[PDB]
Amino acid sequence: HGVCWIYYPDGGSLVGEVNEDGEMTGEKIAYVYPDERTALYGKFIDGEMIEGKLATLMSTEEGRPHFELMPGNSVYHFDKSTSSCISTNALLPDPYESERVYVAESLISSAGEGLFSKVAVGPNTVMSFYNGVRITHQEVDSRDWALNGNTLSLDEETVIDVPEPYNHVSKYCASLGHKANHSFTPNCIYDMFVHPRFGPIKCIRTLRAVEADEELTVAYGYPEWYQVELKAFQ
Ligand SMILES: C[S@@+](CC[C@H](N)C(=O)[O-])C[C@H]1O[C@@H](n2cnc3c(N)ncnc32)[C@H](O)[C@@H]1O
């Protein structure tokens, strides 16, 4: 009858009072990220974010959360990608990701840019989000492989991709998961994540403790560069 909290397996959650229909609808609903501190507070309808403003979960009393809005005017809303549209605001960064990772030249030779941690964190920490356009496995497997550098399977029916133009931070920085390079001794894994803005996607989660400024890597789990590194690793 009072405040309800719906946690997702990934650690994120929706919190607020449910209307007479038992649905997350109102101007005071919020999505709280896995750090249980960063939140998007505002207008939600049936659990879907219409207008969320960056805020901080200051504390909770008997399940009732106390939020404090962060200075600024950036607004966020459910903006699930389509087969051709990656985002309504490609240059609006995700606030949780912004405080945890950054892009820089990779430490891996001839590997282009990489993703690095901004902070020291422990095992199982969500660090970045892998958002992108949604296409079928047939389109990916049928088309020229040279176009599958940023493809990541989401589930049995969808593959996420960050198409050429958008692989440049100057054109797209809403999420940065596609910047993590491959390693056979990775410190992260791709994991399912229910994002309030991106919807069902995958995230980059640490497998263990990582230090500030350490490069984040994941095992792609499969190109020539990969074969070369595999032989070297072996
Ligand atoms: C998902 S992107 C990761 C970010 C990319 N390095 C960039 O600058 O945008 C995949 C591409 O990065 C490179 N990449 C990833 N792991 C690599 C590795 N271990 N060695 C060399 N190149 C790598 C290649 O072009 C590859 O297809």
From Swiss-Prot:
S-adenosyl-L-methionine binds at A111, G112, E113, N181, H182, E229. It is found in: Nucleus; Chromosome. One of its GO terms (biological process) is response to ethanol. Its EC number is 2.1.1.364. Changing K202A: Induces a reduction in methyltransferase activity toward TAF10 but an increased methyltransferase activity for H3 and p53/TP53. It is an enzyme of class 2 (transferase). Its main location: nucleus. The keyword 4Fe-4S does not apply. Changing E105A: Increases near-attack conformations. The record marks Y130, D141, T151, K202, Y220 as: Histone H3K4 binding. Keywords: Activator, Chromatin regulator, Chromosome, Methyltransferase, Nucleus, Repeat, S-adenosyl-L-methionine, Transcription, Transcription regulation, Transferase. Changing K179A: Significantly reduces the catalytic activity. It catalyses: L-lysyl(4)-[histone H3] + S-adenosyl-L-methionine = N(6)-methyl-L-lysyl(4)-[histone H3] + S-adenosyl-L-homocysteine + H(+); L-lysyl-[protein] + S-adenosyl-L-methionine = N(6)-methyl-L-lysyl-[protein] + S-adenosyl-L-homocysteine + H(+). Changing Y130A: Significantly reduces the monomethyltransferase activity but increases the dimethyltransferase activity. GO terms for cellular component: chromosome; nucleolus; nucleoplasm; nucleus. GO terms for molecular function: chromatin binding; histone H3 methyltransferase activity; histone H3K4 monomethyltransferase activity; histone methyltransferase activity; p53 binding; protein-lysine N-methyltransferase activity. The keyword rRNA-binding does not apply. Interacts with IPF1/PDX-1. This is Histone-lysine N-methyltransferase SETD7. It comes from Homo sapiens. The chain holds residues 116 to 361 of 366 of the full protein.
